[PDB]
């Protein structure tokens, strides 16, 4: 077996679930205990707003929470946490520290890797970013014809894209005075082509985000942008006015035509999917200003400290992690839905798809043994209220158990019509989790059918269709306002949830060996596509698809 | 028990699965049988391009496919289909026909509901759409100050939003010469606020899309739009130049105050999530032109005829549906990922979240029996290569089985850099499904680490992390080009897949009773948010969240 399944607190939890989970009914839990919301929620005061983490609509009793906390302890969560924060090389397959918490370490307390405090270099790069932001935002940085920059284009993939994109979308109201921001990530030529079509070479600045500066898709996109730019500028020396790098590869950066003074460094202890807090966040700082970027870091820092200092039983990311374990490893739920009731947060779920699924979509434990239990869930979702009219039908009346996190700011950035829209949004947010829990009893549905004038025959036929079984668990995460600080705290909360789950599963949340095979095979196929000759070097499906491609690419439609 | 589980062919399939499925190994299936691609793929010639549905990388043999086809026949798929197409009232809980196929019935063969041909009215509304599109696109239609329309704003949610949004995004290259299109859907005030901030009341035309014309989100948004408009125009007669309606509810439309000549009608047998083919597609037609809209309809019509006339064993939507059943009901896979390798198709998976999940997220059968088996899956995904660099780690090395459909056009709309970007995109599309199928054996990974110069200790430490178990099934769907015609055929293909699965589960794919309870509960909460008084009328969580909202809404941040 594996570490988790060999653990006796886990065996006890599993045994308790088998014997008792059928007895757990949300309706009954709330009816028996009017202190339930009080005892199963955390109202966090950050001094820059409150975050209420309401986990009371979960299929848990006091005893279940006690068992889960005991399990987190006996799986080494407290020790693993301290190891991360101290700079121990907890990314064990790559022998690397994991120090995204250093990037936002506002206290400046020394954090050592290999005996050397990392904070001077973190703060050096931050200072460089702040200086660059001043130059671009003020209009002092001029393009090749002497004009101020109006547009910033981040070119990057995965971690170099999703973070900056989600945060700039989420924090759009804080971007007054800032340049427009664009994100190019897909190798699909459509992405760069449609971005470039709406831009001027004179006033656009490109941020090429790649640690190694050899990332195929990113560098291809970058070179395409350079080609486009040089067609207009006709001067290789002008590239340095319009292209900067988030990288450590001085030589490749120089070769591209970028001034190495405009290379913004980060370190191997910064994972791609934990990188928005580093130089990778340069586009965020340009868009909303460095002051707001620091507020984002400070919120994350607040949450880092909460995670570090708080006893497990009242520790927000730990509790969220434990609930997930309960549903994944005891109930066997394959997915987790993230449902922010906020249009600005429309890319939040997509971001945590990488954050969660690339971290914890793993099957080998620290010992090298295969897991014999589930690990990370499939993460998905869309913002409310749109989801209600898309897929909540399945959540309410399907055959799947789907843990959902509902998120919403109390205060809206756009209180139009005296707050009418936000009142409706809030009411739907509250109503949906209430409905998921309560359902609708046959006696309730029967009376509704009778009042609608349904015949006894039609009533009988329709009745079961109108019943909602309920007992569907949710978390409600409510916060004062979606500010840079509060957004930073929320992202950090989920990063730490992911960390806790990985430790409990005995997996490495911080590597990504599963990307290798697809990369290797793609490199083999690339040269085979060119020309008319038949490709026979793969399985018949791959061969057959390539044949179709070669046959269909010259057809005029 | 339910119809499916009582079915003898289903119990036979399940028993075969129990006894034999562990012996299905894709790598070995392909080595043993050079004809595998040929026997497990459909190359469809539409005369307007080809669609290759390659299902060879599935965990199936000839025997499995034979049993699945036999099950489909046993479940009455052909009769159910014919009933749909002839206008039988197969939406049995609402006593309605289901005739999205009539909307695109290019042949104009009569289809009767209650003994009356529906086609004259379908075609009457199509002619009205054609005329309106010509007037707006030509610049002949003038706003209240006498200026041509530059922007179209679709206000609608769910079925009234996702279809037109996904199609206009997918068909963006075909929109040259058309007005800019905007979609407002969320009740969240952000959505309409940031849309209106970018518009002029003089040159904006709003399209209020609502089957019922009573949906709170849509009518609220519409009323906000009208107030904004009237603040500028100061003339109620001007509304008729700037607002049109897409609805089935004439009375409610006139009640809102729209010119009855500005109402584009559809019918109760048009489901919201099947409605882009109706008047609901007006924003599509305005954006890309009525000719391209007709091509979209014609593509769907082609696929309707394929579905209607083709033997089950060669019938694309039926085969896709059957593979789905195999994974859902035999393997127990909760999800289905849709992965189009096309940035224009970035909303394709979202569309089918509604389409699939709202249709088949059901638990009561035609007989009134509660299902005792799984129904519709959770549908999710992102376009390649975006999704690739986000979450494929979990698909390759997680603990979940995830059937994936990979989709790509052979011909790109933007063949930049002499096709370099599309070559890379295609190679990744191909490599990923090859990788998922083949994996990488311990001995293969050992040889790679051997060659990298890893020491015995370093090799042994890393080895298990580098192993890919493979045997992960995929569909590859490749088509000549994403034209309006081909897109129409692809959407209809999945609509019919959803239909077939529903018939097989004995559920009603065409109702959505699961939305009612959330709506009722939201109406109750709305007025309780007003004022500073404590709410005690709900469970303690709802009460507590409301207390939080009231406490937090006045805090300055």
From Swiss-Prot, chains A, B:
This chain is encoded by the gene named Gpi
Catalytic EC class: isomerase
Q: What does this protein do?
A: In the cytoplasm, catalyzes the conversion of glucose-6-phosphate to fructose-6-phosphate, the second step in glycolysis, and the reverse reaction during gluconeogenesis. Besides it's role as a glycolytic enzyme, also acts as a secreted cytokine: acts as an angiogenic factor (AMF) that stimulates endothelial cell motility. Acts as a neurotrophic factor, neuroleukin, for spinal and sensory neurons. It is secreted by lectin-stimulated T-cells and induces immunoglobulin secretion.
The annotated pathway is:
Carbohydrate degradation; glycolysis; D-glyceraldehyde 3-phosphate and glycerone phosphate from D-glucose: step 2/4
Q: What happens when the gene is disrupted?
A: Embryonic lethality caused by impaired gastrulation. During early development, the egg cylinder fails to be divided into the three cavities, suggesting a deficiency in extraembryonic mesoderm formation resulting in the failure to form the amnion or chorionic mesoderm.
Name of the featured protein: Glucose-6-phosphate isomerase
What is the organism field in this record?
Answer: Mus musculus
Q: Which UniProt keywords apply?
A: Acetylation, Cytokine, Cytoplasm, Gluconeogenesis, Glycolysis, Growth factor, Isomerase, Phosphoprotein, Secreted, Ubl conjugation
The UniProt record lists the keyword Endoplasmic reticulum: no
Q: How does it assemble?
A: Homodimer in the catalytically active form, monomer in the secreted form.
Q: Which SUPFAM superfamilies match?
A: SIS domain
């Amino acid at each position: 077996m594996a570490a988790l399944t060999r653990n006796p607190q886990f065996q006890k939890l599993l045994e308790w679930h088998r014997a008792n989970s059928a007895n757990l009914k949300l309706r009954e839990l709330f009816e028996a205990d009017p202190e339930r919301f009080n005892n199963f929620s955390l109202n966090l005061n950050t001094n820059h707003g409150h975050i209420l983490v309401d986990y009371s609509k979960n299929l848990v009793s006091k005893e279940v929470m006690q068992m889960l906390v005991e399990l987190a302890k006996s799986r080494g969560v407290e020790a693993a946490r301290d190891n991360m924060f101290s700079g121990s090389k907890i990314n064990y397959t790559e022998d690397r520290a994991v120090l995204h918490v250093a990037l936002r370490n506002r206290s400046n307390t020394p954090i050592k890797v290999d005996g050397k405090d990392v904070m001077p270099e973190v703060n050096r790069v931050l200072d460089k970013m702040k200086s660059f932001c001043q130059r671009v935002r003020s209009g002092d940085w001029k393009g090749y014809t002497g004009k101020s920059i109006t547009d910033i284009i981040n070119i990057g993939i995965g971690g170099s894209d999703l973070g900056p994109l989600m945060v700039t979308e989420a924090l759009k109201p804080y971007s007054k005075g800032g340049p427009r921001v664009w994100f190019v990530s897909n190798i699909d030529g459509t992405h760069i082509a449609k971005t470039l079509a709406s831009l001027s070479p004179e006033t656009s600045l490109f941020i090429i985000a790649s640690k190694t500066f050899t990332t195929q898709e990113t560098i291809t996109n970058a070179e395409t942008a350079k080609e486009w730019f040089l067609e207009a500028a006709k001067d290789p020396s002008a590239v340095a006015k319009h292209f900067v790098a988030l990288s450590t590869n001085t030589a490749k950066v120089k070769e591209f035509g970028i001034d190495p003074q405009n290379m913004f460094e980060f370190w191997d202890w910064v994972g791609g999917r934990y990188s928005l807090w580093s130089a990778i966040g340069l586009s965020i700082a340009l868009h909303v200003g460095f002051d707001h970027f620091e507020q984002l870091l400070s919120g994350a820092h607040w949450m880092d400290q909460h995670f570090l200092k708080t006893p497990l039983e009242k520790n927000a990311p730990v509790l969220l992690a434990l609930l997930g374990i309960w549903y994944i490893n005891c109930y066997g739920c394959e997915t987790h839905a993230l449902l922010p009731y906020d249009q600005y947060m429309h890319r939040f779920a997509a971001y945590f798809q990488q954050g969660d699924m690339e971290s914890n979509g793993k099957y080998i434990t620290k010992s090298g043994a295969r897991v014999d239990h589930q690990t990370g869930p499939i993460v998905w979702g869309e913002p409310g209220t749109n989801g209600q009219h898309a897929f909540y039908q399945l959540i309410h009346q399907g055959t799947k158990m789907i843990p959902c996190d509902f998120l919403i700011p109390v205060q809206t950035q756009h209180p139009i019509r005296k707050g009418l829209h936000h009142k409706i949004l809030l009411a739907n947010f509250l109503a949906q989790t209430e409905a998921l829990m309560k359902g609708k009893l046959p006696e309730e549905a029967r009376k509704e059918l009778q009042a609608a004038g349904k015949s006894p025959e039609d009533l009988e036929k329709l009745l079961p269709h109108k019943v909602f079984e309920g007992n569907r668990p949710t978390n409600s995460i409510v916060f004062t306002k979606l500010t840079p600080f509060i957004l930073g705290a929320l992202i950090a909360m989920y990063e730490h949830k992911i960390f806790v789950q990985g430790i409990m599963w005995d997996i490495n949340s911080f590597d990504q060996w599963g990307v290798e095979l697809g990369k290797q095979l793609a490199k083999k196929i690339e040269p085979e596509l060119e020309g008319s000759s038949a490709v026979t070097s793969h399985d018949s499906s791959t061969n057959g698809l390539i044949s179709f491609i070669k046959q269909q690419r010259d057809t005029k439609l």
